[PDB]
Each structure stands twice: as structure tokens, then as C-alpha cells.
# Entry
Amino acid sequence: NTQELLDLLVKCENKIQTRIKIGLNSKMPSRFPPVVFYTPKELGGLGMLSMGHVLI
Amino acid sequence: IRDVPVLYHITGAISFVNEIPWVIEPVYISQWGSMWIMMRREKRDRRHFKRMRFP
Amino acid sequence: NMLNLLIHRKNLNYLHLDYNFNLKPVKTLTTKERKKSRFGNAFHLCREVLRLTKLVVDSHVQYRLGNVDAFQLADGLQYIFAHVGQLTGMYRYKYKLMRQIRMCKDLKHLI
Amino acid sequence: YNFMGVRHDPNMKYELQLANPKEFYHEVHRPSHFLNFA
Amino acid sequence: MIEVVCNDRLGKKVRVKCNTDDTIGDLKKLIAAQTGTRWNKIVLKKWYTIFKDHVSLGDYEIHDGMNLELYYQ
Amino acid sequence: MANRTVKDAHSIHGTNPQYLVEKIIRTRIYESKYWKEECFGLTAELVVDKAMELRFVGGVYGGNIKPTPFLCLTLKMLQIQPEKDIIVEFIKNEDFKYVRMLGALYMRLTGTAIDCYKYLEPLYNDYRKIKSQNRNGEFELMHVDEFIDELLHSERVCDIILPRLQKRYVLEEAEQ
Amino acid sequence: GYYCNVCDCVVKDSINFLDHINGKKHQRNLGMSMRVERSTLDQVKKRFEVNKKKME
Amino acid sequence: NDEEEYEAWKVRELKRIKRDREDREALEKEKAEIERMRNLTEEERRAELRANGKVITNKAVKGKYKFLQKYYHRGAFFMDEDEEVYKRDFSAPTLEDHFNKTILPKVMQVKNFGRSGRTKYTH
Amino acid sequence: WQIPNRRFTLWWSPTINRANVYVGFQVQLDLTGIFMHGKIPTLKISLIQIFRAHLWQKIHESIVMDLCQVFDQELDALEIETVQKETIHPRKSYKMNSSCADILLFASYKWNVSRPSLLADSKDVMDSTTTQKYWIDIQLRWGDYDSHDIERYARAKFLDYTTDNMSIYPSPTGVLIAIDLAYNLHSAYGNWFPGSKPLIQQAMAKIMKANPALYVLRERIRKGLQLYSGELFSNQIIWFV
RNA sequence: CUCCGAACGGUAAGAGCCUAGCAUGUAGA
# Structure
């Protein structure tokens, strides 16, 4: 219920996703497709616990 | 069309137009406004479905 | 003549500048050839400014030739400003030209 | 029907009769070999 | 409609939205409207594979955001 | 070889003599089998034999733009730059329609507008048909009169740019 | 591929062999690249006469 | 087809003569149309004579950007040919406009470390 | 079950390698060819180490000879002539433009060529020219998450390379069998022949299973992703009875 | 509701052979 805290975590989760992307490539993808970031661990993905809206 | 001065080097690889254009007050006002009135009433008259080419 | 002299003066026979002030590659070859090509923000900016210039001048040329009248030079100067936004010489050169373009589009909206 | 494999189907129905069958290399058994004439 | 980008190796990058059943011919006509050259003088490829004009987009499987090669014959 | 065929003979109207067509079309025509066979050796009678050999009208075809033999003969004639008498004899020869079309294209390309009109005025009376190649490479049927009227009109043909001087009324008011 | 017996070199393409023909030291012994036009009239006259004679 | 060939040649020559005469008469007709428009604006009818419509080459089919649909311009480089590919009503979501952009937390213009612009077109 | 970044890279390389996900793409890597849209540097070195040697060219050759041997199992019944395994360029499968077909089919006498058709539909149309030849042209293509429709890609590539000049080909007909090694699919869609659809259907089945090239590829991928479950001349050894 | 972005960070690494568009304008005897 603290809206500034809700907004800070959203941009930071996108920031960590950006750091993973700029690690994966070097040229800052136009749209890193959201599956291989936000998908679950045991089925061979990165398992971000994403506390922010992002449409697939 | 009128004309202009021109300053050409003998190399002729450049030609600046030397006449720093020097119109008058109400003269240029009434000129471009005359074009405004004739332009609007020109659109009033013709059905002129035309423009220039892109290139 | 000026920019084509610069282009052929850099020992690069791969590109042929359009006389309507474009630039297009010829052989569909780049990578190594592109790596001595894709450069010179000054050349792209100067080609842009001359492109807007030559669009204006050739517009008045075909005006005083064959379809000048009153429609062509007026509408062409107007869409030449709106196309200084949309067609030619875009923001790839310098920063603030988007601000002058947006002021141009707004002035067009008023008029 | 070895020389004409396109007319053979597993779901095709056919009747039988009491007569002697022709050879494999017979002219009635191979219409494609006799029709190759330009 | 799908948006494509036709960036070149000389600062020539254009963005055009076109529909799905549309062919490469009308798409080259729309690029010609965009970047100020003739439509028959546009050759757009995928690194040595030249996209022929008559075949539609869904056969080449071009999707929204994909980059082409813009060249001139 | 491919640079220039004449050391110092003449010049073009407003460009280089070897650069009358576009540079992309010149680079595409610089690599071909018939173009290499012509650049290995080319004379006036050899150009006449090459014009009498092939009867086709067209430019580049397909995605991989390859030049037509008529375009290769036109490029070799523009590079070699023959005299006006040989071009007038090729335009006046009605035996070979392809050689007459090549001479008409050479006279409309490098010639003056008055000479182009004086050479295209007998060209409008030729009702003989000729083979034409489309942009996709398919063969198309056309006539010599339609190609002469297209060459006497504004430049809309592929790999060709030859503007006129004025209208017919303005040219008639200026001279004959 | 292509073979040049004058230079005894192996050309991998046709343009390499056609180039090795003339435009090289072999051409320098063959008269280099110099070729002129043949007259004006007589070449076109005899060419049109021979072409019309061989045609019909 | 010598007779048909001569007939077609005569047809083409007649068409060319008609085209030249039509260019001359088209200059004359531009003059006459200017004169007729002037006379009509003078004494045709006070808001009682239109005799025309709103003839425009390219269709003006438009829509409405949902919340932040980009100003996708069609490009003013070819507008007189009146081709069918142009009239297609570009008011659709291209890549990112498919979303609603209303349920989002506060606002998301562009998350690419480049929001130098600061506006929403409200003031 | 620098190392683990590479495993993530390959196990999602089919979604992390695409023009849509990197806008300005043009590269063909090497050997067969990979749409490496970027640097994607770890994925690049790994995919070269995945396609270890001349393995792709061998895959094309093994698929071609297997299709020929499957045809050599009904050639007489299909009224062919003989094995028309054509000659090709040395590195010929490493290109993306042309298709000079490996397996022509010199028919015995006047086969009847059908229309353009896909190898899934049944409403064939055998009402056309009486072709002396249909050609079999292989094409292999590493797909993506937005290139994974081999059938549409195949109909496109066949009608394109047929229509354009661009290329030599066989006579009048080249039925282009094409299998996408990424999503293991099978496709051919153009001028089908007289009655060859059942042949090519069972052929694509018998080729996709068990062909030693495809097995070597699947095993190389599994062990990389680490996720387990003239008689005097040499090389001419024969027998003399 | 109409604020439209451009480039670098990106294509390897070389082996033997083959072909090209250019540039200077000299004192000397």
C-alpha cells in the first residue's frame, strides 16, 4: 500500500532484467522476449520472482 | 522570378547569393497577405484535386 | 560535385550518391566495406542540409518549368516544411533539430 | 500389375475368375512399355 | 498490421506498418513513398538472399519488428 | 578496359562519357558474360555484328540484376563513342530493327534534342514489331513505333535518363 | 577451374581468366590494352553489307 | 497482319495528335476553368451553387490512438498516384499499443533509458 | 539435471536469437548457416562448436542419398529411369539463394505433373503439363520462435526460386523437400508429381527418424546442452569374387 | 488523443591465386 515503494521495485526489477539482457547480448535488444527471463528455474530458466506488471 | 546578385569564385566551386534580402514593412505585409486572400479564395473556387510530386 | 568529390576522394568505390541527395550502396556489400563507410556525422549532416536545399530548389525548378501556377510552389513549400519533419534530413545528425521540427509542425498546425 | 503400380490400392475391390493369368513381362501386363513410342 | 524497419548501412532506417497478406511489391511501393526513391529501384534482402517481389509476406515469415536490408540496384 | 575506351575523343552532355547510366546499373553491367566478351574486344563492325546477332529490348531483370544484351551493346557504344555518321547510318538502316533501335537509343542518349527529333521523326513510321523483355524476365510483344514514341517521350524506361529541351510548340517557335 | 597457360595460373572464376587474357603482362606482349575504332563509314558499310549478305 | 498493323499505327498516330492537341487545349482549359471559377464566385449564386465535392487523391481514413499509439505518419513523398496501399486507416496497434496502458502502475512511456521527453499531451 | 551462461544461452537460444529480438540482423555464421542476429558471442562460439565439423554438408548429403535410396525402392513402379543424383557445388548446401536440385527424376515415359500443392492437403490437381521430370531439391533452415513454420517457408522459397531467373534448375518441376533442423519439422509444397505424395510422406517419416546425420545432430545437441535422458586408387576398397 | 529518436558498443581470426576508380605535373643536358 505504499505507492512509491510499489513504483521503485517495478523499475528495479526491470533494471535487473536489463542487466541480464545487456549481459546476454551487447547491443541492448529491442524487446528481450519475456519468457527466458521470467520463467521458472527447474524447467531451465532464470526464475525471477517478478513483483511488477508486465504483459507477455 | 526577379533576380539576385551572385558572387562566384573563379574556381566556380561555390556561389553565394550576396543580396541580404531587404523588403519593406507594409509592402511585404500586404504582399504575403494578398497571397493569403487570393489563396483562400482560390481554394474556395477550384476543386483542385492536385499537389506537387514528392520528389 | 562537392560531396561526390569527397566520396570518390576517399578511395571507396562502393557507394553512389543520388543527385537528388540520397546515398545508396551498390554491390549489397558491407561488413568490411561498411566498416570504412558508415561514419562521418558531418557528411551525413551536410548531405541532409543540402538535401533540404535541393528539394526546395528543384521544387521551384519544376515550378518555373511545367506545373508552377499557384498550387505547386505554395503546397510544396508547405509540405516541404512538414517533410523537413517527415521526409528529409531527420534527427540522426544533431540533437536539437527535433525541437525546431516540432516547432515547425506546430506552426503548420496554427496556420 | 508390377509395371503399373499407380492403379494398385490396398482398399481396392476386385473379383475373381477361373482362367490362366498372363506373364509378368506380357504385353497385356505392361501397357507403359508399349506406349513409349515417339 | 505488422511494423517493419528497413535500416541501411548509411543512416537510412525507415519504419513502415503494412498488412499481412500484402506482397513485397506493394511493400516496396510503400518504402518508396517513405524514403524518396523509385519502387523498382529498391532491392531488399536477408544477407545474399534477395527477396523476390511477387511472393507474400507470410511466406517469407516476416513479422512485426523484423529488419530487412535496403539496397539499390 | 572498363574505365574508358577513348583516350580523348569527346565528352558527355553533363556527366562523364562512360557514366551516362546509373552507377549501380554500371556496376551490375560490369560483371556479365556478354559484357566481358564485349570488353575483351569491341570494334565498330563488331558492334554491328553484335547488334545484328541479338534482337531484344529491355533492361535488367530479376532480383539479381543482370543486363540485357541490348543494354550491353548500348554501354559498349557509349564507352567507345563512335562518330555521328555511323550512328546516323545505324538509325537509317531498316534491315536490322535491333540495330536501328540501338542507334536510336544512342542518338537519344548522347545526341542533341534537335538531332534526336530529326532522327526520331522517321522512327515513328516503323510499324515492325520487336521482341521485348519485361522486368520479371518474361518475353513481351511490342512494336518499334511504341518504343520510338516512348524514347521521344519523357524518360520512364529502365536504366535510361535523357531529358528533352522543351515542348513541341516551344521547339517549333524556337526553330524548325 | 579456368587455366591460363601463358601465366600457367589457375583462375577460380571466369573474370579472372578473361582478366588474365588481356590487361596484364601477357597483353603487354600482345600490345597492352590499346584498341581504336575502325574508320567510320567503311566499317559500317562493309559490316552492313556482310551482315545482310550472310543473313539472306 | 499488315492491314491491322497499319490500322493500329494510324490509331496510335491519331492518339498522339490528340494528346498534343489535348495538351494545348488543356492549357486553354486551365485558363477557361480559372475564368469560370472567377465568374462563378462573382455572380453564380450566393450560397446556391457548388457543382463540386471534396475530391482528394488519398483517402482520409483515420481513427483514434488508444492511449499512447505513436504518431505514425504515412510519409509525404508519394501522394498523387492514388494507390490502394495507402488507404488502409493506420489507427491500429503496431507493436506495443495492443496493451491498455491504463492498468499500469503510474505510466510507462518508454523503458529504454531514453525518456528525455517529458509530456503526455494534456496541457 | 563461463560455463553456465553458455548453457542458458543455448537452452534458450531459439528465443534469444532472432531479428525481432535484435533489430538489424544480418549474419550467416559459417558452414551450414545461422541467423546469428548479433554478436551473441557465447552463442556464436558454442554453435560453431555444436556444428563441430563439416557436419551440415554431410547432413544434406545423407538426407539426399537417403531420399534417393527410398526412391530406388519403387522407381520401376513409379516409372522412373534411374538415379539422377545430380552433381552440385562443393560447398553447395552452405548457400541460401539457389537450388540446383540433387535428385532429378527422369521419368520413364510421360509422367503427368500436378499443380502447385502442399504435402498435407489431399485435393491434388494433376491437370497440367506432362512433365518429363520432377526435381527433388533439399533445403535446410535453422528456425526460431518466429521462423518455425517450415511449410509456409517452404512454399515461399520454392515459388521464389522457381519464379525468379536467378538460378539454374532442372527441367520444369522441382518438388522441394525441406526440413527445418531447429524444430525437427518436415515440409514440401509446390509441383507435386503423379502419386508421389504417399512416397514423400513415408519418406519424410523414414528420414526424420533414424537417419545417421539427424542422430549425430541430436546427440551433439544433447551432449552439448548437458541434459541427458581405378582400382589402384585408395578409398576404393572392394571385393573380388 | 497525434512527443515520430540515430549512431558506437555488431558481423571475425588467414592461408595461395586473380582483377581494379585513383595521384604528382618539376631543376637537369
